[PDB]
Amino acid sequence: IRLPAHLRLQPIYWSRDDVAQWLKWAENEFSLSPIDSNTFEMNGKALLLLTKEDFRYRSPHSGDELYELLQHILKQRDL
Numbered sequence: 001i002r003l004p005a006h007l008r009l010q011p012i013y014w015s016r017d018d019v020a021q022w023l024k025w026a027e028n029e030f031s032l033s034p035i036d037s038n039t040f041e042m043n044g045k046a047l048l049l050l051t052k053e054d055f056r057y058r059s060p061h062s063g064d065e066l067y068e069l070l071q072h073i074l075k076q077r078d079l
């Protein structure tokens with residue numbers, strides 16, 4: 001479980017393309033239910049404004065995990 005290099009930047013500087021790459025990494029690394037990138041068409045600054053409920057409406061089957069993954073990155077936790 002190692003973050004892609006470009007995603008090692010603080011998330012507030014993440015592009016919308018970075019967000020898409022994060023979704024792909026997460027899906028593969030944690031074997032999540034498939035996520036459509038069109039459901040998170042936003043940059044990192046916007047992504048950080050989302051609540052857990054917001055993630056779940058965009059990805060009913062993977063939203064919760066995605067939110068908790070982002071929380072772990074923000075907390076600089078390990079993994």
Ligand SMILES: [Cl-]
Nearest residue numbers: 043044045046
């Ligand atoms: Cl902006």
Ligand SMILES: [Mg+2]
Nearest residue numbers: 013014015043
């Ligand atoms: Mg930017």
Ligand SMILES: [Mg+2]
Nearest residue numbers: 015016017018
């Ligand atoms: Mg972009």
